[PDB]
Amino acid sequence: ALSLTADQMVSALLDAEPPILYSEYDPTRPFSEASMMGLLTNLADRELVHMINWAKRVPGFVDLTLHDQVHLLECAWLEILMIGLVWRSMEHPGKLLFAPNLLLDRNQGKCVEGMVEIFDMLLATSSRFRMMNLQGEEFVCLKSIILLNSGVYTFLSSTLKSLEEKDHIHRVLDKITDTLIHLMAKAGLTLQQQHQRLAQLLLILSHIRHMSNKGMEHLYSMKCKNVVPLYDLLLEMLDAHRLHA
Amino acid sequence: ALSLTADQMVSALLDAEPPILYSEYDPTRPFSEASMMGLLTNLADRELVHMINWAKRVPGFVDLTLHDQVHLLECAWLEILMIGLVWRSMEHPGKLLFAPNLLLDRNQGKCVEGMVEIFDMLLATSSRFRMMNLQGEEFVCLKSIILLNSGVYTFLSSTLKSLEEKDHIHRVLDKITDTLIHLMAKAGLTLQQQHQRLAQLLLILSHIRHMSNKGMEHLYSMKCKNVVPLYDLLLEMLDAHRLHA
Ligand SMILES: C[C@@H]1CN(CCOc2ccc([C@@H]3Oc4ccc(O)cc4S[C@@H]3c3ccc(O)cc3)cc2)C[C@H]1C
Numbered sequence: 001a002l003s004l005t006a007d008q009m010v011s012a013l014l015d016a017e018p019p020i021l022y023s024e025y026d027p028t029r030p031f032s033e034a035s036m037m038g039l040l041t042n043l044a045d046r047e048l049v050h051m052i053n054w055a056k057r058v059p060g061f062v063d064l065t066l067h068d069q070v071h072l073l074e075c076a077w078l079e080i081l082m083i084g085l086v087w088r089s090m091e092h093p094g095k096l097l098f099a100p101n102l103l104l105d106r107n108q109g110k111c112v113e114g115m116v117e118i119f120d121m122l123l124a125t126s127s128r129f130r131m132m133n134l135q136g137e138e139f140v141c142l143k144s145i146i147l148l149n150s151g152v153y154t155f156l157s158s159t160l161k162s163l164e165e166k167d168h169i170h171r172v173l174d175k176i177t178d179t180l181i182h183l184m185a186k187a188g189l190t191l192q193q194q195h196q197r198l199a200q201l202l203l204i205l206s207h208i209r210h211m212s213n214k215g216m217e218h219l220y221s222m223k224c225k226n227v228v229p230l231y232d233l234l235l236e237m238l239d240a241h242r243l244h245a
Numbered sequence: 246a247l248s249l250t251a252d253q254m255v256s257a258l259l260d261a262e263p264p265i266l267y268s269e270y271d272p273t274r275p276f277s278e279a280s281m282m283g284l285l286t287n288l289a290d291r292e293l294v295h296m297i298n299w300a301k302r303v304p305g306f307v308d309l310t311l312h313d314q315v316h317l318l319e320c321a322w323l324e325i326l327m328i329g330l331v332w333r334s335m336e337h338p339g340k341l342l343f344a345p346n347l348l349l350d351r352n353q354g355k356c357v358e359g360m361v362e363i364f365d366m367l368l369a370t371s372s373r374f375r376m377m378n379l380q381g382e383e384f385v386c387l388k389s390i391i392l393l394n395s396g397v398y399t400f401l402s403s404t405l406k407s408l409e410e411k412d413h414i415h416r417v418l419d420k421i422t423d424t425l426i427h428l429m430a431k432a433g434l435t436l437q438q439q440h441q442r443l444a445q446l447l448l449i450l451s452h453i454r455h456m457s458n459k460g461m462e463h464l465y466s467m468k469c470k471n472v473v474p475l476y477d478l479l480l481e482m483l484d485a486h487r488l489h490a
């Protein structure tokens with residue numbers, strides 16, 4: 001990613017996109033009977049496996065140590081799910097497209113205590129993306145920045161190796177920055193609009209962090225899933241052999 | 246701020262800076278006997294009055310409705326205190342300069358259950374600012390962006406007035422973006438370093454949001470202060486008469 005062109009980064013990021021999954025419930029059966037958090041939790045957990053696959057395809061990520069890859073994903077996984085959700089909801093004003101067969105409005109969020117607060121922030125972010133006319137090429141840049149940025153300030157250590165890792169990450173972030181500006185210039189924005197648009201995009205990332213933090217707080221009162229530490233579960237998924245090569 | 250030059254914005258922001266306050270404790274008396282959270286809370290509350298004064302001097306802020314000014318400050322006050330703290334700690338490696346007479350290391354943070362976690366993030370942010378060689382002119386831009394950005398996605402409404410307000414804020418943020426790039430160009434960074442440095446600065450704001458969220462979670466288990474709603478207290482401070490004109 002530090003020798004990749006802007007064009008090569010964009011195509012690698014587009015190539016790495018995960019699939020859109022469906023909610024798993026019998027569509028021949030009634031709805032009051034479904035647990036909305038059960039449905040949402042089951043969806044999010046299935047997405048997580050595809051998120052690791054994606055992460056490994058972001059330029060520069062697998063050059064990191066396994067521990068650092070784990071750390072970054074443990075820090076960013078809910079931000080990554082949420083930016084994905086806001087992106088697929090953009091063309092669905094007033095609703096959240098959790099899955100193609102699970103499109104929910106704010107009143108359906110009231111179904112779970114404390115959830116409408118989260119729904120309302122996601123919906124607002126979706127509206128901001130639509131208003132900005134966010135582009136698919138810009139979106140994949142933003143999602144990769146979330147992956148690389150959100151945990152880079154909290155690694156414990158400052159070993160030599162740790163210092164090298166942080167350097168590499170900042171270097172990859174720099175290339176994604178170069179890519180976003182390249183995208184915008186190719187689109188014919190002026191120099192001034194480029195830097196303004198870059199700032200507008202990066203400041204939305206502060207809101208997505210906010211939503212992740214509040215959603216983690218909200219999740220930690222429900223059942224959703226807290227068995228086996230997330231780090232261990234991530235480590236397992238990430239620590240693959242090369243036997244099915 | 247939408248007709249202010251880059252130079253005029255920078256000088257208005259420098260002119261608006263709040264003073265550095267001292268911790269209030271008898272320096273002739275021992276320390277084990279002081280409540281660290283009492284000291285910290287008393288300091289932070291005294292800063293808040295100066296924060297409103299400052300906010301009113303940020304270009305474009307008082308053109309907002311009183312309700313919107315309240316909202317922005319209710320959303321950003323801890324981010325604003327924290328970026329201030331990390332800025333005055335930059336030249337004090339391993340320590341947090343809460344006040345000139347209150348410089349604390351991570352081990353002094355262990356004094357309060359769950360506080361060392363927060364200290365360690367603040368310290369890391371301070372280290373990142375030092376490594377970036379953040380400049381006083383850049384800092385005041387970042388603090389004003391925090392003020393205008395952190396609550397602009399969560400206003401309830403979407404009245405006409407509400408829509409106009411959001412427009413004005415995005416317009417002011419755009420000018421601060423223009424100011425940061427101006428600063429960097431005047432410093433002789435290349436076009437490419439400008440946009441890279443702008444992105445590095447704006448991504449730190451995602452970490453400061455993170456620290457605010459975690460600190461709000463941590464504060465909500467202690468005594469610190471929760472009497473009278475923050476909105477009302479802010480409204481009072483902000484809703485000034487013009488009699489002492
Ligand atoms: C192994 C770990 C345990 N899993 C627990 C469940 O996590 C989730 C459960 C539900 C969702 C909720 O449903 C989804 C589903 C898919 C998606 O892409 C985004 C969201 S966001 C939403 C939500 C998030 C926070 C909140 O407070 C309220 C709603 C999102 C995550 C998460 C997984 C990484």
Ligand SMILES: C[C@@H]1CN(CCOc2ccc([C@@H]3Oc4ccc(O)cc4S[C@@H]3c3ccc(O)cc3)cc2)C[C@H]1C
Binds near residue numbers: 459
């Ligand atoms: C009227 C409202 C009630 N006041 C309650 C006390 O708030 C604070 C109390 C202590 C601090 C703690 O002390 C300071 C003091 C000054 C400063 O500029 C920054 C900090 S940060 C730190 C802290 C923050 C969060 C945390 O979990 C642990 C430590 C920061 C804020 C906050 C005020 C807006």
